[PDB]
Design a binder for this molecule. Structure first.
Ligand SMILES: Cc1cn([C@H]2C[C@H](OP(=O)(O)O)[C@@H](COP(=O)(O)O)O2)c(=O)[nH]c1=O
Ligand SMILES: [Ca+2]
Length: 129
């Protein structure tokens, strides 16, 4: 896989963010995770986590996997990096997302994320508390 440039347009919630990609606005849904909805427990905390990470970033990058690049709502499906740190992984490591939505062929970082999850669960962090 390869990283590609994007610039933040707006943080939306824990697992959705709007970026300008190839010069066009696109809402991205983070691959391989599920954050709680804002109205659910830890949802505001996930939203705030993601927002801080992407807002403070000097450099946003998008990384598509090998499969589907957009979902049925037209959202981009990617791994998102903030100054080289993967948002998707960081959410999981902090117990602010579960590994989820693992579809065959867009699952390159699955095992990386599951390892993060296991450590968040051992630590009894957030969702796992
Ligand atoms: C993360 C992800 C979600 N989706 C779809 C499945 C779910 O469909 P349904 O809307 O029919 O439940 C929805 C979950 O996203 P959200 O967690 O953002 O709601 O998005 C994909 O198709 N591919 C993906 O990789
Ligand atoms: Ca969600």
């Amino acid at each position: 896989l390869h990283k590609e440039p994007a610039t933040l347009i707006k943080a939306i919630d824990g697992d959705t963010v709007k970026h300008m990609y190839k010069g066009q606005p696109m809402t991205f849904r983070l691959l391989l995770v599920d954050t709680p909805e804002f109205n659910e427990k830890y949802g505001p905390e996930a939203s705030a986590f993601t927002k801080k990470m992407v807002e403070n970033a000097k450099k946003i990058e998008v990384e598509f996997d090998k499969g589907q690049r957009t979902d049925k709502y037209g959202r981009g499906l990617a791994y998102i990096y903030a100054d080289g740190k993967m948002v998707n992984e960081a959410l999981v490591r902090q117990g602010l997302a579960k590994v989820a939505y693992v579809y065959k062929g867009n699952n390159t970082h699955e095992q990386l994320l599951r390892k993060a999850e296991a450590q968040a669960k051992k630590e009894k962090l957030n969702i796992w508390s």
